[PDB]
Amino acid sequence: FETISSETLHTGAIFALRRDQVRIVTREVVEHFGAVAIVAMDDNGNIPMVYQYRHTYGRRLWELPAGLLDVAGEPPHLTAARELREEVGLQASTWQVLVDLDTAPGFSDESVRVYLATGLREVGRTMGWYPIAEAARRVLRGEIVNSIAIAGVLAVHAVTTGFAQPRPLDTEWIDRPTAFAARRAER
Amino acid sequence: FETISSETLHTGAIFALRRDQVRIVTREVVEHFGAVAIVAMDDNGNIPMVYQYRHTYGRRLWELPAGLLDVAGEPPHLTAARELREEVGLQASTWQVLVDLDTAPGFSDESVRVYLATGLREVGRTMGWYPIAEAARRVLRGEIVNSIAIAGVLAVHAVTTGFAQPRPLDTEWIDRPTAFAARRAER
């Protein structure tokens, strides 16, 4: 395949719409910052989840703490750690890579890195705590549909059941977005 | 929350970009057809997966057979069944709902229904067959990143391990997209 020509159709707050001419057909791409989410598992196998309104669906969805990689030059896990604190007031001693997911492969370059945070300390001074198994059943029951949450919950469930292991922070993030950030549309 | 006003910024082949004024801030939404995917498990616990090029990432990703709900008035599972046949030349006697996922909750209304198809017959006249456990490990190892694939693979893995059950075809698909189709931008 080959990109013949590409044209910017729109630049917004968190993404830009671009149209390319490929190998020869049209291919519209939503350039995204990319994001990070966190599965913060405590000493008893519970993780915190937030109930957030999503205008796209016109309703609140249960999700993992998460934020966009909108801070230029900021390392992903630093962004992640920041969100875990701001989102659920937790700090973690151990940070590992749990699962990366390409959210909308058909039309956007967004990719999300989900970290597994352990060794939690409540710091600072809607969300709910769920036993990992309870969370896994909510997924398989349709009560958790956010794609990042689904991946993170079922991944940590596979880990907690001894089926798989978390990974090193230096694990390559193959599809981490760069296009939108490269635009630097900020005065 | 409340949508003050909404403006169409772009209408493309598979999606439209719309900007709303919410409750008061800007909220850009990518209206999508929605899609369906299939986890076709054979009698030995294997499922077929396709290796497809995704321009968004500039590379091929391992995925579950899937297609957009771009056929007006066509029932999702009929679309699904059609794709399973066209994509991997398989027909299934049993169709159930496995997992629904909201792909990019932050900027698009797309939602994808993943069905579990069983009782397979090879019909007609790149893809590969994977034991469900092999597929689950590929996910946790980063070799499967497509979000729909991640959800489907780990969901059927939870099913095959006896942790959860498939669901009836009449299960409500809460976030099934309707906006883009409603536009009917076809002469």
Ligand SMILES: Nc1ncnc2c1ncn2[C@@H]1O[C@H](COP(=O)(O)OP(=O)(O)OC[C@H]2O[C@H](O)[C@H](O)[C@@H]2O)[C@@H](O)[C@H]1O
């Ligand atoms: N469609 C949009 N249009 C304009 N602004 C938006 C839009 N969507 C979100 N924003 C905004 O960006 C800011 C949200 O930042 P974060 O809290 O860092 O991230 P978040 O929206 O929760 O997304 C993290 C991740 O989860 C979602 O599943 C989303 O798809 C993304 O990958 C919001 O306060 C608001 O300015």
Ligand SMILES: Nc1ncnc2c1ncn2[C@@H]1O[C@H](COP(=O)(O)OP(=O)(O)OC[C@H]2O[C@H](O)[C@H](O)[C@@H]2O)[C@@H](O)[C@H]1O
């Ligand atoms: N960004 C795009 N711009 C223009 N046309 C596109 C674009 N992306 C895909 N298409 C096209 O739509 C048709 C593909 O249809 P399907 O095979 O029905 O579906 P598919 O693209 O594989 O997507 C199914 C699902 O998987 C992906 O993860 C995608 O995010 C979606 O939910 C392609 O042949 C081509 O016309």
Ligand SMILES: [Gd+3]
């Ligand atoms: Gd935030």
Ligand SMILES: [Gd+3]
């Ligand atoms: Gd097709």
